[PDB]
């Protein structure tokens, strides 16, 4: 009745991928702040990149019941929206197993938007981060 | 012109403290199953409320110019709205020092929406984390 | 003539598997609030489980000439003993590869057991845990 | 109903201290190799301190509860005992502020006694742990 | 006879700092990849800086026997020095205890170096790293 | 333009392997202090043995664009050289994947540096690290 992970034992090796994306959506000033170029605290873009990275290859720590993995590769894009007043995250994560990586994934563009946050929070104090979903996981879904 | 923390030495001590939501939004017999009692995983909100707090204590480790700061107080409150079709998560972070912890009350209530997305997957594959945000932080904000 | 670990490189892929547990004794007051439910931190073995889970999956960090490893499955499971005044923990770890995974049974159930004691420290200053040993593992020892 | 930590705001900054013990029990010639000098794996007291030192370190990443807290002294002494078949494991913990610090004296104790255990595995299969439990805290207790 | 940290009880409170320097020697190509602009790998100076911030922080966590510090400042600057055929690394980091922070320093040059090297490996298999050193410490030492 | 690790998918299975070498420049009496036997810290060659080996299973985490990967071996081996006034570092990671471990061993020679300096701080105020760089990695170069 109370937690407990599932057997991966046997499921056999596939090559396995999942792609999320993340909005962080704020006021012009700010947004306009990340492309020129930016806030105190430095590259923002480049910062939450990395984040996102390093948060992904860390999510068997932050998730309980998840599953140490071998990732094979971890991609984390920024893309201003300057008509939404906002920054869009995408992210991809790939690994040959058994597994799936929808939570790398979606945690890899979690830790992006909250070091977004975190480098314009002085700026504005009422960013909004969502929505947080999947696009395509990989039967299986696409987008 | 690139990332480079601020330094927090003449800022002096005080009693700081912050709150943040987030939610998660699915299907009505995916929020049911977490109601009666659950997924194949276990007790949704009592792993998502851990996964929150031990969360909160690394946000120093997850992102890139945040301060290790000794946090004095860490909440994770989870809600089912079957009215909404999804489930609200309310945190609070506290402590005495100068740095606040906002980042530290985001970042848990990000985990734990990661970790109720986590126990659910297998039954609902277009979960949707969002909105993620300030209500709180202590002048300030309030709410 | 100092720390060296072994090669596992040729040894073979094969099904691993281990079990272990641990005890924690206390005062028939604290053991009934956990039955009751609870001491002012929260629900005991919820807590302890996901602990002992995390702690599994960690062992290769805290056990230095350890090997890390895909984990595979981790069960932590409490049993509260009121005729023996104590609390049984049972682990279980599974994984296909070389190296076995008995550390991270007992871990897990030292983790568990030392989250229990945390729990309820402030109700009794003398609970002791032990004793944490195998029960099994997998020629092999079985129990 | 479930987890919440407790507010150490207003609790006054003092000197705390703790004190545990553990004991590692096994056969004649595996205690023997250890003072002879040892397995295949090293050093096992040096090793078995040092990873005592470094687990007190991360409790607070450990234990969910925990408060994490700038540790001022940890000393983690092993003795063996022929008489008894055993290792005898003493740990010290000290900091100035206002948590005590019985979890982290238990878990440097705990993990110090994981890594005698991992370094001797090979030569015996039922080695126990225990008893683990605090001699000393600091009213308070004393030994 | 073996490891054992000193107390830091009696030391009282003061302003710490330290500096250091680090050097990774190349081809006159792969630091002019470095330049213009870069590697299949990306930012070199980027990814080094938030490499050797987030590595200070966690210098307590690599070296057995240091103590865990609220950083109140930690900068890592690089610069191409053609000339030389070289990379430049200069770190500081600062906070408010008794504790002196040069370690701190010289793990965030250390790492800051090693991540330069992974992101040029592929193009170069014979660069050093070196020397690694002290500037500033702070009665104290300077340069 | 920024961080973007590259994909290790296709790239078959093979068994890996790198030495590394690190010198910590020294003293006489600071050198002769841990031949002799050492420092107020403790014994210096077999703390900095074991950092050296954790570092090495933890490169993943310190190094932003790495990949996690099962280690099968790790050695650090300590060499007084008091002809020099210096300590000789040699390391040696190898594991079976497609990856190769050369900034295990470069991380592991680093950190195993760094934990000499730390127990000759008090000591000696100028010591200097360096050279750091590769020996062998396993086509590919050697030594």
């Known amino acids: 009745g109370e937690a407990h992970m599932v057997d991966v034992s046997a499921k056999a090796e596939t090559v ?5 994306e993340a909005f962080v959506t704020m006021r012009s000033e700010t ?5 020129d170029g930016r806030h105190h605290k430095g590259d923002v873009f480049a910062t939450a990149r990395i984040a996102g990275i390093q948060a992904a290859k860390r999510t068997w720590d932050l998730i309980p019941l998840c599953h140490p993995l071998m990732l094979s590769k971890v991609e984390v894009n920024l893309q201003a929206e300057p008509e939404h007043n906002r920054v869009r995250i995408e992210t991809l994560c790939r690994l040959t197993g058994k597994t799936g990586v ?3 994934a979606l945690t890899a563009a979690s830790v992006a938007a909250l070091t977004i946050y975190d ?3 002085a700026v504005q104090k009422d960013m909004v981060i969502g929505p947080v979903r999947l696009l395509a996981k990989s039967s299986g879904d696409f987008k």
Chains 1, 2, 3, 4, 5, 6 share one sequence.
């Open 102 to 104: 929808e939570m790398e």
């Open 119 to 121: 480098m314009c929070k």
């Open 16 to 20: 396995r991928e999942a792609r999320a």
């Open 31 to 35: 947004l306009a702040m990340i492309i």
